[PDB]
Amino acid sequence: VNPTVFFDIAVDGEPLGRVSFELFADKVPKTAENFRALSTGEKGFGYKGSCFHRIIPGFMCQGGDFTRHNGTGGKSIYGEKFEDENFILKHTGPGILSMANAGPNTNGSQFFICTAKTEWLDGKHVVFGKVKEGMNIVEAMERFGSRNGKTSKKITIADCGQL
Amino acid sequence: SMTEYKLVVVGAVGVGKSALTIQLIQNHFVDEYDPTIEDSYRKQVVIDGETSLLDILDTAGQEEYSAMRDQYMRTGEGFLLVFAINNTKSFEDIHHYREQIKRVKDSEDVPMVLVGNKSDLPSRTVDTKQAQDLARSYGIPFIETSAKTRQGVDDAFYTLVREIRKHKEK
């Protein structure tokens, strides 16, 4: 069965709520395994404590830079970057979990949660999971965003792991 | 006198668009890279004794989202075309930015300044002569700048204002 992971989201350190994700190990196994391991921290690094640094209402919540803490960094469990695995799945609407990148074959750890359909990213960003529970928490995170992505309070992954 | 100008800073990712803008607006430089989505700034300046409000639109280096980027170009009155002197691709990219501006504004006479940034770095790949010749072939000014040392920062923006002023009053 596809694994499930959770993020406990915090606002300036205060609990906001929990978001859980189904990871599509059945169709995107290498990319799902990276996100799973980064969520548990089992390699000695990962998402816990990192920030959703770019939140743009109507589009997405982006996070995952645990190496530079400024939106430029992150790394995978396979090295600094890994190839685009496939583009089977598309950015079909709210809750889609997909890899951020800086061009072809630059997957690291940064990711985004769609808050709307973003079909123009199809074929350029690898979709590998979806929100299971907590879309209402994602909707709350979105309200902290702005046009250029800067958030009005600091939104962090206070805890995360595999369910 | 009092006037106002909409200036737009364009160029490939990482060439120093934001660092140049923040040096003009806030008079400081940091090595830290904060990638731009979109930022807008307002500053009152005096150029050649004439007071002006500068509205600076600091764009992202990415060239997707043509609908938004076309609007940037329709609204802007003058454009800084920024490349980095140690990034040959960013210099090769310059003609695309100019072609887009001419296309969107349907004009061969749009105020623009070519900016060669990071002049402080000892890792040059683009010769000054190459950039001078390209700006000359465009009929626009060329200025080398460093956001780190502030060299040429005021001159780059003030030169673009002078190009706009000339265009408006001609």
Ligand SMILES: CCn1c(-c2cccnc2[C@H](C)OC)c2c3cc(ccc31)-c1csc(n1)C[C@H](NC(=O)[C@H](C(C)C)N(C)C(=O)N1CC(OC)C1)C(=O)N1CCC[C@H](N1)C(=O)OCC(C)(C)C2
């Ligand atoms: C023209 C304005 N504009 C718009 C847009 C378009 C229409 C209408 N209104 C707007 C906005 C509201 O008008 C201000 C967008 C938009 C997006 C960008 C820049 C400007 C944008 C942008 C910049 S980088 C990127 N998009 C892809 C980004 N990659 C990185 O962050 C990587 C990291 C993962 C390493 N870095 C940092 C990097 O690539 N560097 C290039 C350099 O290398 C060294 C750094 C990435 O994967 N995602 C995950 C997927 C959504 C996407 N971000 C994102 O934010 O879309 C925002 C969105 C959807 C609103 C589109």
Ligand SMILES: Nc1nc2c(ncn2[C@@H]2O[C@H](COP(=O)(O)OP(=O)(O)NP(=O)(O)O)[C@@H](O)[C@H]2O)c(=O)[nH]1
């Ligand atoms: N040495 C040196 N570094 C510079 C100079 N200008 C910018 N930098 C550095 O180059 C990096 C990128 O600068 P930045 O202004 O963010 O570039 P940008 O064109 O705005 N990038 P983007 O398109 O993503 O918004 C930063 O680390 C910054 O400190 C310069 O004149 N000299």
Ligand SMILES: [Mg+2]
């Ligand atoms: Mg910038």
